[PDB]
Design a protein around this ligand. Sequence first.
Ligand SMILES: CCCCCCC(=O)O
Ligand code: NA
Lengths: 166, 166
Amino acid sequence: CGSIVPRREWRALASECRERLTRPVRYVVVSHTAGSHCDTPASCAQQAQNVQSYHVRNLGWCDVGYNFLIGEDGLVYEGRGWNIKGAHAGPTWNPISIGISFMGNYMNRVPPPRALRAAQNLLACGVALGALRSNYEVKGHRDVQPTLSPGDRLYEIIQTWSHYRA
Amino acid sequence: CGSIVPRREWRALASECRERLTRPVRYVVVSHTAGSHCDTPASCAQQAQNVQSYHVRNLGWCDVGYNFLIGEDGLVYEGRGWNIKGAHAGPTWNPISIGISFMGNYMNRVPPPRALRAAQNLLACGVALGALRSNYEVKGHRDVQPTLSPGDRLYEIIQTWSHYRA
Ligand SMILES: CCCCCCC(=O)O
Ligand code: NA
């Protein structure tokens, strides 16, 4: 639960986000970035920077929209974290969910087991902290918004998860 | 609790080790491999293979001697794990300790924060599982055996840890 790459370590611009989530949060929404893939701590720190740059500079958002990002390096990158409302699943789901995004496009490829392990351990951590309900529900991005996110291959994997609910 | 690269994923030779540790284990001994470092899941899986090869083929040991290895990629590699007696700290400490080894030489270098985080969260996981006592003690390799292990720079860092006792 303490094995998250913190904001400063991936050279994140400072957050301007103020809106808080109400703990414990019932929902996890799993997205993909549909961005470049990365499989080294060096390449994934850069990728998290690029995603945040797009969201802050181009979209004018207070921070990277996701609560956490997942690298194919098997590390979790701190986004808005447990306590700050994300921008990842639209205005109905953002206030009542944690958004975790796998960095890449998983339409025609899977994240490696280390990426999946990182995500599953992140969610266990959320329960332990009281950030997530013990009985949290995992949704695919496409289950709550019109998108291919989180990609067909990754979507089929999260459908098998104990906490998945269509 | 927590995330770990399992034996099969780093292509480990099958273990022949049978001798069990008595849970909960009171002591953690921190070593270095004094070997080549690695900072990618690909390079660290190979490094764990190389360390195990040395221990099994050359030293004739039943498995890699460490209970867990720590990569500069920020991942933990499963060694003998929580339940099997290691070969890392000699015949007095092996039966009463978990041996975790940072892959590299930390005489004139520190492990990156992600490596240190991985190790600290591995130990929290051990407590959560009942593998380690809640009041476990961290020892440097050099505190229980005549060696420079775990290297001057890493030794100075583990001296600052909550559970460290010389
Ligand atoms: C606040 C909860 C921390 C629990 C300790 C085990 C963990 O690393 O998740
Ligand atoms: Na002491």
